[PDB]
Amino acid sequence: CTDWDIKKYQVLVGEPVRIKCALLAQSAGLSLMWYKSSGPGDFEEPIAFDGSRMSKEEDSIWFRPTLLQDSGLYACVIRNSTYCMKVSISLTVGENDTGLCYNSKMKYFEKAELSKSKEISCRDIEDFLLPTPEILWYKECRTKAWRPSIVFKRDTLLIKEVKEDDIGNYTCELKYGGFVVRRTTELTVTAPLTDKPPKLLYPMESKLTVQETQLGGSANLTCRAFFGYSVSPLIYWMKGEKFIEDLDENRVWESDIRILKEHLGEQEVSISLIVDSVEEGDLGNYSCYVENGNGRRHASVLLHK
Amino acid sequence: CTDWSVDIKKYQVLVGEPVRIKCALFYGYIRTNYSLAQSAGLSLMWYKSSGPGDFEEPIAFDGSRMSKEEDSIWFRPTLLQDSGLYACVIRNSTYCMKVSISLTVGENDTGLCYNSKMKYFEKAELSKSKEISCRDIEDFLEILWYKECRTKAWRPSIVFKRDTLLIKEVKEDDIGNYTCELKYGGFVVRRTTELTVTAPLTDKPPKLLYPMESKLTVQETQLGGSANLTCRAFFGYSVSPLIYWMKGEKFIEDLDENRVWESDIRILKEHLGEQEVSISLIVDSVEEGDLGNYSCYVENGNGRRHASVLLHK
Ligand SMILES: *[C@@H]1O[C@H](CO)[C@@H](O[C@@H]2O[C@H](CO)[C@@H](O[C@@H]3O[C@H](CO[C@H]4O[C@H](CO)[C@@H](O)[C@H](O)[C@@H]4O)[C@@H](O)[C@H](O[C@H]4O[C@H](CO)[C@@H](O)[C@H](O)[C@@H]4O)[C@@H]3O)[C@H](O)[C@H]2NC(C)=O)[C@H](O)[C@H]1NC(C)=O
Ligand SMILES: *[C@@H]1O[C@H](CO)[C@@H](O[C@@H]2O[C@H](CO)[C@@H](O[C@@H]3O[C@H](CO[C@H]4O[C@H](CO)[C@@H](O)[C@H](O)[C@@H]4O)[C@@H](O)[C@H](O[C@H]4O[C@H](CO)[C@@H](O)[C@H](O)[C@@H]4O)[C@@H]3O)[C@H](O)[C@H]2NC(C)=O)[C@H](O)[C@H]1NC(C)=O
Ligand SMILES: *[C@@H]1O[C@H](CO)[C@@H](O[C@@H]2O[C@H](CO)[C@@H](O[C@@H]3O[C@H](CO[C@H]4O[C@H](CO)[C@@H](O)[C@H](O)[C@@H]4O)[C@@H](O)[C@H](O[C@H]4O[C@H](CO)[C@@H](O)[C@H](O)[C@@H]4O)[C@@H]3O)[C@H](O)[C@H]2NC(C)=O)[C@H](O)[C@H]1NC(C)=O
Ligand SMILES: *[C@@H]1O[C@H](CO)[C@@H](O[C@@H]2O[C@H](CO)[C@@H](O[C@@H]3O[C@H](CO)[C@@H](O)[C@H](O[C@H]4O[C@H](CO)[C@@H](O)[C@H](O)[C@@H]4O)[C@@H]3O)[C@H](O)[C@H]2NC(C)=O)[C@H](O)[C@H]1NC(C)=O
Ligand SMILES: *[C@@H]1O[C@H](CO)[C@@H](O[C@@H]2O[C@H](CO)[C@@H](O[C@@H]3O[C@H](CO)[C@@H](O)[C@H](O)[C@@H]3O)[C@H](O)[C@H]2NC(C)=O)[C@H](O)[C@H]1NC(C)=O
Ligand SMILES: *[C@@H]1O[C@H](CO)[C@@H](O[C@@H]2O[C@H](CO)[C@@H](O[C@@H]3O[C@H](CO)[C@@H](O)[C@H](O)[C@@H]3O)[C@H](O)[C@H]2NC(C)=O)[C@H](O)[C@H]1NC(C)=O
Ligand SMILES: *[C@@H]1O[C@H](CO)[C@@H](O)[C@H](O)[C@H]1NC(C)=O
């Protein structure tokens, strides 16, 4: 039968899951089958349904609860006299690690700006909603008394003003017929957006630094700048109108950008310009260009002797 | 900059073994090499996010273990921390591209040499040859093979050739996890594969068990009653089993009463790829028209067999 899934399932052992065949079928005479492979290339064993945990319900399989055994590839096949279709679903079951409520490999991630609003939502909770709903939030796998600044509405968490204290793993809990559904997200805070172009440190914008090199010598011109949080940092060297790529590719080349420091999204990167076997043409005024969202700044270096 | 969400290539390694993460942009996406691209002034940076939504911190290498060598990153050895998403970015005045590579690091579980989630899989036919190879090994260029995480003396049926394991005749006993080991400068490289043996190709069409091919079984039902007609067959290894009910020329879908429907296929047994499935035909509020001869059709690659059932009373 025709063969091809992007949808992947991650769940903690002891939590209810619903796996759907990605593709009225009973009416058309179509017969539906599932296979568990547990790996790419495996036997794809036919599943004989029990009634306690694994339930064949409509277009889906229900696990109540899930077990470590359940981890694997699930292939849903539809069969007819002349018609067939099948698709494979990946289910990974893991256990919360050592006293924690969640699994390290299995969690969501978010980023927030200091002194700014941020919303945290309980994602992928649709399959347990009826009739048309209670949720509890944990901080570092512990119950907390939440400040009035933080507001809870309908499966979501809102922080009106975000502080450097509000960092870590946020896990929401749902009750599903004597079962718990946990979705955990980790928040990382960064400094707010710059609103200002980066700052040149070496060379400075208005000092006109001087570099001395002898002919047939080696020249190292190293720019340095500070990039506040705002894409990779854009810092590069130019000699007048000519870009680094244009001038004499055999003797002169540009180094890769280095990260001298990083904190809260702010970086202090440095890049260097290297010239070998320096000649009369190489001597002149070199400028380090630094650019971002709000501006383009540059400073100059003089090559002498 | 222009983005390629996630690279198909993913890395799975045991903690304490060497890994090499390759920037996909130089090998697959773009033909131009790192040595010639950098000449054009392109700058390369890496980021470690550990998640699709995380901060993506810029990594300052500065390490004995983590080495920025050309278009790749070297881990010698790898650590449990290293698990995450690695994004390589190329920078220009007006040009940018980035791609993300997934590295997953795990530890051998409870007295075992391997990780259950991280291993290869294979299938073999009984009494036939099958070769097991040490896959995706390179950048570390002799091999030694273990069976069930133990050193073994191998029969002349099993032969060793560089980077491969060959079994002339596969037997039902030689099933399980085969792990090859390589030594790379005081480090060990383990690649483990699991073998599952199945019965050889049928060469014969399936066999009807219930009803039998030439007995013409009879079921008695009263009018306004309930009818359960359950077929049963044996399918040897050869895809889902093709077994279905028919009433004369008409398929089950054709008569399409709200009263008569077909059940889903059930798996009564499984051994070595051989199945003995059963399907049932159900009729509710039986009427005079429903009475007649029903046939259960069973089919596979080499043949089509069928048996008949008579509905009476
Ligand atoms: C028309 O009539 C047919 C009868 O031919 C009905 O089909 C039967 O439906 C019943 C449903 O109750 C089936 O009963 C099931 O038996 C399965 C087989 O047993 C397992 O155990 C042995 C070991 O002894 C294994 O070797 C074997 O491979 C099986 O795995 C069970 O798996 C079923 O589920 C569970 O049952 C008990 C319930 O407490 C659990 O404790 C068990 O752990 C088990 O998981 C179930 O018991 C019966 O097999 C069917 N027969 C056939 C021939 O298909 C149709 O349903 C009916 N049509 C209707 C009503 O529309
Ligand atoms: C939920 O959110 C919390 C924070 O809100 C996260 O906490 C971090 O958890 C990780 C583990 O996943 C911690 O990493 C581990 O802890 C060690 C502590 O680091 C400090 O160590 C000493 C004090 O003991 C300090 O002096 C030092 O400056 C460090 O700040 C790490 O150092 C460990 O790595 C070390 O060990 C390995 C092997 O032993 C070595 O090879 C390494 O080189 C390294 O030395 C270890 O990885 C991390 O520290 C926690 N952060 C904080 C701030 O406490 C949770 O991770 C998060 N939940 C999940 C699932 O991620
Ligand atoms: C190649 O490598 C793979 C993977 O490493 C091996 O697959 C293993 O196969 C063995 C079979 O010999 C499996 O062993 C079995 O473990 C099961 C554990 O389940 C228990 O726990 C769950 C909850 O987590 C319960 O639901 C369940 O009822 C069990 O309690 C059990 O089915 C068996 O363990 C025995 O221990 C329990 C106590 O826990 C006893 O009460 C029972 O009597 C029971 O017999 C069974 O032994 C093992 O789990 C498989 N591993 C994985 C990861 O799937 C291959 O075997 C290996 N190849 C070769 C040739 O060895
Ligand atoms: C051109 O000039 C630039 C700037 O002057 C220069 O950049 C320098 O690069 C080197 C490495 O390529 C840096 O040296 C390292 O700095 C970091 C600390 O941030 C550490 O990794 C190292 O510290 C120790 O390293 C050794 C152990 O690995 C120790 O033995 C050693 O004693 C150190 O303690 C190492 O110092 C250097 O920091 C920068 N320069 C600046 C100012 O940051 C570049 O290399 C020059 N040449 C080119 C581009 O060809
Ligand atoms: C996070 O993971 C840990 C371990 O991975 C989970 O701990 C487990 O907790 C259950 C219930 O408390 C334990 O089962 C019970 O064990 C006691 C032992 O006396 C027994 O009397 C009970 O009848 C029941 O069987 C289980 O042993 C324990 N697992 C361990 C210790 O390895 C924990 O539940 C997970 N979730 C969290 C912390 O939210
Ligand atoms: C980074 O630098 C600039 C900014 O966009 C780009 O410059 C030019 O890009 C073109 C197409 O990518 C390059 O094509 C070449 O054209 C020459 C023409 O003589 C031809 O001989 C080559 O075979 C090739 O087709 C061109 O070299 C390049 N010019 C430069 C770098 O000076 C560049 O493409 C950007 N991106 C990179 C380098 O990946
Ligand atoms: C399992 O990993 C440990 C390191 O945590 C190592 O010492 C041990 O040798 C490994 N097992 C085998 C069979 O090599």
Numbering used by the authors:
A (entry chain B): 31 to 34, 37 to 55, 66 to 174, 177 to 274, 277 to 351
B (entry chain A): 31 to 171, 178 to 274, 277 to 351
From the paper:
Vertebrate type-IIa RPTPs comprise LAR, PTPσ and PTPδ, which share common domain architecture with a single transmembrane (TM) helix flanked by a large extracellular domain (ECD) and cytoplasmic tandem PTP domains: the membrane-proximal PTP domain (D1) is catalytically active, whereas the membrane-distal PTP domain (D2) is inactive. In mammals, presynaptic type-IIa RPTPs form trans-synaptic adhesion by specifically binding to their cognate postsynaptic organizers through their ECDs for inducing synaptic differentiation of neurons. To date, five different types of postsynaptic organizers for type-IIa RPTPs have been reported: interleukin-1 receptor (IL-1R) accessory protein (IL-1RAcP)7, IL-1RAcP-like-1 (IL1RAPL1)8, neurotrophin receptor tyrosine kinase C (TrkC), netrin-G ligand-3 (NGL-3)1011 and Slit- and Trk-like (Slitrk) family proteins. To elucidate the structural basis for decoding the ‘splice-insert signaling code' in the type-IIa RPTPs, we determined the crystal structures of PTPδ-ECD in complex with IL-1RAcP-ECD and IL1RAPL1-ECD.
IL1RAPL1-ECD consists of three Ig domains, which are arranged in an L-shape.
